[PDB]
Amino acid sequence: SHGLFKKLGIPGPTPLPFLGNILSYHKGFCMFDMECHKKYGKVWGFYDGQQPVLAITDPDMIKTVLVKECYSVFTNRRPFGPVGFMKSAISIAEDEEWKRLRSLLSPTFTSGKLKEMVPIIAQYGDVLVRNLRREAETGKPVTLKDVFGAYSMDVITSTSFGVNIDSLNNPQDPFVENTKKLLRFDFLDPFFLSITVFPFLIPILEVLNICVFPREVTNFLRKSVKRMKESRLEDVDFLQLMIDSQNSKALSDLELVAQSIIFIFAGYETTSSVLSFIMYELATHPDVQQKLQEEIDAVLPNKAPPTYDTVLQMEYLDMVVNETLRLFPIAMRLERVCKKDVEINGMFIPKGVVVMIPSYALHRDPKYWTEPEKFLPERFSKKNKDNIDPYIYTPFGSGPRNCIGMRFALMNMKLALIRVLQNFSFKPCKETQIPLKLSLGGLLQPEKPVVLKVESR
Amino acid sequence: SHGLFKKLGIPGPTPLPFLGNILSYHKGFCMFDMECHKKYGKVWGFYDGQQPVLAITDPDMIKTVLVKECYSVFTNRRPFGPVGFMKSAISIAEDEEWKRLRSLLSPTFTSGKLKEMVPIIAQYGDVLVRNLRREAETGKPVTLKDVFGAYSMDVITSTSFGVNIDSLNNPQDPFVENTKKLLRFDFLDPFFLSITVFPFLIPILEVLNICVFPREVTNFLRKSVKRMKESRLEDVDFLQLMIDSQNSKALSDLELVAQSIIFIFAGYETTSSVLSFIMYELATHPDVQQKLQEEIDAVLPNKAPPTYDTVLQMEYLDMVVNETLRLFPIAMRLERVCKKDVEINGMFIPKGVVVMIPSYALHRDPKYWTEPEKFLPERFSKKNKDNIDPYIYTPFGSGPRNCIGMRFALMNMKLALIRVLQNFSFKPCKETQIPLKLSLGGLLQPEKPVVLKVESR
Ligand code: HEM
Ligand code: HEM
């Protein structure tokens, strides 16, 4: 397998027996992709164990992969380990099963449904603010991941199940204790590297019902969901939307639970992390934070509560969120498996190769962005935004298999930022890491938790 | 596991995850051991996958391992893969099972038994000579491994089973076709490297009856042996010695067959290879070849047939054989597993570590041998031989688990050399590789087969 890119005349780091190139992950995924881009140019290939991965950076080729040939050739992501029934989660499902699930779930994420969820989201912005004020009146530095983590979970439990908890102050509530375990996978941890080198072990793990999603958590949520369903049946959240959908091919009961679980997984740590990065940037660029506070006060005088429509009115807020996601595209990479031999944009790609789009590297490419390391919201101004290629800037992916939750996530984050910035200004501590450094693990996160001073307005 | 030698303050090449140091075998075992000895000194540690291996070179420590603490601590070699019933072969057996087998088999290899086998061995020296003469009368270069391979097999089939074949001229005889498959393992081949990196797969292979000894061969020999046994029962070879032994704890029928098979394995390619190296050295040092021919003619005038006692009379023959085995110790390394935490000669060795004695590296160590790359039989002269440390010079190992076949092998080789040198002189071709280069694989063998001109005396 390790002779593939050599045979195709594609450059890339020379692989080692068994390992491929995984030893080059010692400084994390993003540094690897940046260094490869710099060394090899527009396309390169490497090996995750024995799995060939072809990295592409030409926006035309990216469009072909993510959009034009999504259904025919590049439909699925790569398998990553033993998943049991979570096989049915839309992010893991393949081919026609995926296409069916995306159809069934698409109406659930429309703006019309989002707009109806906003009062629920807004409520926990109030909770977030009350909790923040408690920490602002006692001038103690605040750990963002903790406070935005609780916010993220509060929005999840209410908008997905109508479970209303102040999780920051109720950490040992059984529901919170279980859902909080649905964190992102670290694909550079020993287990996932071992599976990468020994992928032939995954069926053995599956037959023994060993799953990368914690069984006690999925068991808890399966029986919780069944309780909720039959209390509702009979006598605004994602559960009810899905319950209504299978009220017709329609969603299996097991499929329903898989989606409830994956939505938590998809939105919990992702939202929290992006909010922490945004607040870090605002704290370290006071002028941006002030300008944003000025916009919010203009659109919503007298600390008026945010609404769906007023959120969409805030252009500078949009610019700040988009520029943070340029710097910190937490997915790092996008991937699709090539399901058949194809030739796209003049290049032959063999069946079975994983095609990868290195979002982080492209987001920080000097050839596409002036001073790419700098936080500059004007990049996304109404004037400049037309000049941004949607296949270079891909924090939510692109095409039919992009982030189905993108509108919700953006609304969720913006509602939080508005409420928080109406009430507080955030400033650096001396224990604030400046400049922020990224972890060298398999997740895009700060090396040390972001800690900030919170001051009442 | 990879932090062990670091923790003990023992030097050695820094291992890679999963692989340990096996990528350093790319130029073979012997080059690796030479380079480590040079770089790290008297002791060093490395990792075969996750298995720690401690290399030692102090003759006092070597004596402790191979002799003093053989029974208590360093009894067994390391496991190497799926072996099925060949588990019972004496070279593979462990602990009390080994100790029992060595006891049962020891009387079989006494000089008294050897002396009785010599007329049988001698017969195939005559066959070897007749076959060589056929190739000498038609001045075609001879490939040593082919001619000494056939000799080695002829001696094996007759001295182990009383099966009398001219294998050179009967290659498609079913017995020869099967026994010829019992070649030495190449532990650097893809299968054995894979097992080294994935040793957790060996039990899976065992439960499926996948064995590194070819099943069709062992099946053939098992049923051949059973035929022979019951033709002999009722109505001088190793089989009869073993048959007599179980005529008493006594050797199982399955144990008996395991030994018959392992003796072929142990003696077939080993004898052939050493004979080829010796003839290479004689051909490239005509003065040595002549002196040896002079000794043989003195001891056995008029091409007198060699006998057990006249062979032992030939001191220069002994020197030539011993010096070739110094240059080419085909086992390369000796190994023992440490079965309990011990401290020997001031050094702590943890349970489970493989202790390795790098025979090849010590045989070519400039600090023990003047001009170690040169073929100099006088090293082993009656005068100089006292100065040779038996823990530095170890072509047949040392101690209670040394080569049980050593006397036989030496007699076998000497009888062949005598008969051959009485009749022929061996000279280089232009297709003779000079200087000889060694293979970079996992076996100590010439890079290209040794080919020589054979001239009738
Ligand atoms: C700031 C927060 C988030 C970011 C940055 C983000 C980013 C992404 C990215 C990059 C992908 C891969 C798209 C591709 O491969 O082209 C993805 C997929 C997905 N995301 Fe999000 N996401 C976020 C929040 C959410 C939320 C709140 C949900 C709620 C349901 C969600 C649900 C999903 C699902 C289900 C997929 C797989 C879609 C499919 O395979 O059909 N994500 N997300
Ligand atoms: C020139 C030819 C040969 C050489 C260089 C050679 C070398 C060796 C070496 C280095 C060992 C390991 C000793 C140790 O670990 O200390 C060994 C073991 C052994 N050899 Fe030989 N050998 C040769 C021929 C033979 C022959 C003809 C036989 C016939 C039976 C034989 C049978 C064995 C057996 C059974 C063992 C394992 C002993 C035990 O574990 O108790 N070898 N040999």
From Swiss-Prot, chains A, B:
Source species, domain of life: Eukaryota
Role noted for this protein: A cytochrome P450 monooxygenase involved in the metabolism of sterols, steroid hormones, retinoids and fatty acids. Mechanistically, uses molecular oxygen inserting one oxygen atom into a substrate, and reducing the second into a water molecule, with two electrons provided by NADPH via cytochrome P450 reductase (NADPH--hemoprotein reductase). Catalyzes the hydroxylation of carbon-hydrogen bonds.
Assigned keywords, A-Z: Disease variant, Endoplasmic reticulum, Fatty acid metabolism, Heme, Iron, Lipid biosynthesis, Lipid metabolism, Membrane, Metal-binding, Microsome, Monooxygenase, Oxidoreductase, Steroid biosynthesis, Steroid metabolism, Sterol metabolism, Transmembrane, Transmembrane helix, Ubl conjugation
Record annotation: effect of changing residue 161 to S: In allele CYP3A4*17; exhibits lower turnover numbers for testosterone and chlorpyrifos
Misc. comment: Chimeric transcripts, characterized by CYP3A43 exon 1 joined at canonical splice sites to distinct sets of CYP3A4 exons, have been detected. All are possibly produced by trans-splicing. The chimeric transcripts exist in 3 different combinations: CYP3A43 exon 1 joined in frame to CYP3A4 exons 2-13, CYP3A43 exon 1 joined in frame to CYP3A4 exons 4-13 and CYP3A43 exon 1 joined in frame to CYP3A4 exon 7-13. The longest chimeric isoform (CYP3A43 exon 1 joined to CYP3A4 exons 2-13) exhibits 6-beta-hydroxylase activity, while a shorter isoform (CYP3A43 exon 1 joined to CYP3A4 exons 4-13) does not.
Cofactor or coenzyme needed: heme
GO biological process: aflatoxin metabolic process; alkaloid catabolic process; androgen metabolic process; cholesterol metabolic process; estrogen metabolic process; lipid hydroxylation; lipid metabolic process; long-chain fatty acid biosynthetic process
Effect on the protein of changing residue 377 to L: In allele CYP3A4*13; lack of expression
Protein name: Cytochrome P450 3A4
One term of GO molecular function: iron ion binding
Disease: Vitamin D-dependent rickets 3: An autosomal dominant disorder of vitamin D metabolism resulting in early-onset rickets, reduced serum levels of the vitamin D metabolites 25-hydroxyvitamin D and 1,25-dihydroxyvitamin D, and deficient responsiveness to parent and activated forms of vitamin D.
Substitution effect: residue 406 to T: In allele CYP3A4*3
